[PDB]
């Protein structure tokens, strides 16, 4: 079985260094990550099919995030996403 458990633990230790987490909260966070991934991937697929594109790009995921997430969350998610794409391209 593949899960997002160790990455959620790494993000938690980055954010809260002395706060632990239980197994049920891990199952909820894994389901949250899977649900958000499915939502953004489905919206980006629908965006690619609307404009006669056979490719999902970072632009597709960006406008899917901007469609799905509310205002402050959308703006900040665009901020770290564009930062990550910029750092991936530069190195």
């Amino acid at each position: 079985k593949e899960s997002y458990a160790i990455y959620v633990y790494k993000v938690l230790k980055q954010v809260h260094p002395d706060t632990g987490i239980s197994s049920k909260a891990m199952s909820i966070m894994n389901s949250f990550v899977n649900d958000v991934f499915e939502r953004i991937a489905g919206e980006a697929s629908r965006l690619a099919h609307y404009n006669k594109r056979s490719t999902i790009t970072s632009r597709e995921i960006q406008t899917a995030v901007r469609l799905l997430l509310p205002g402050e969350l959308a703006k900040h998610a665009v901020s770290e996403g564009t930062k990550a794409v910029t750092k991936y391209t530069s190195a």
Binding site: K24, S27, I28, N30, S31, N34, D35
Partner: protein, 81 residues
């Protein structure tokens, strides 16, 4: 198995109303709440059994219930996905 809707007892509906913030409950609430629960359980269980029978299984797994709940927009985190 017959007449198991009486297993959802009156103090159980009282506790569920207390969690919703209901200070005072009338006596005709319980039959309506039993009917509402039966309608909801029929709607979820029918889709779960359909998902099970497509898989040619004899057991209703938790993911079938999760997919049934996601079918009518009642996503349930904590049981798999």
């Amino acid at each position: 198995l017959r007449d198991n809707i009486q297993g959802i007892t009156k103090p159980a509906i009282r506790r569920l109303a207390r969690r919703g913030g209901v200070k005072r409950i009338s006596g005709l609430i319980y039959e309506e709440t039993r009917g509402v629960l039966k309608v909801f359980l029929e709607n979820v269980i029918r889709d779960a059994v359909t998902y099970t029978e497509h898989a040619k299984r004899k057991t209703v797994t938790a993911m079938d219930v999760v997919y049934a709940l996601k079918r009518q927009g009642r996503t349930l985190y904590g049981f798999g996905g």
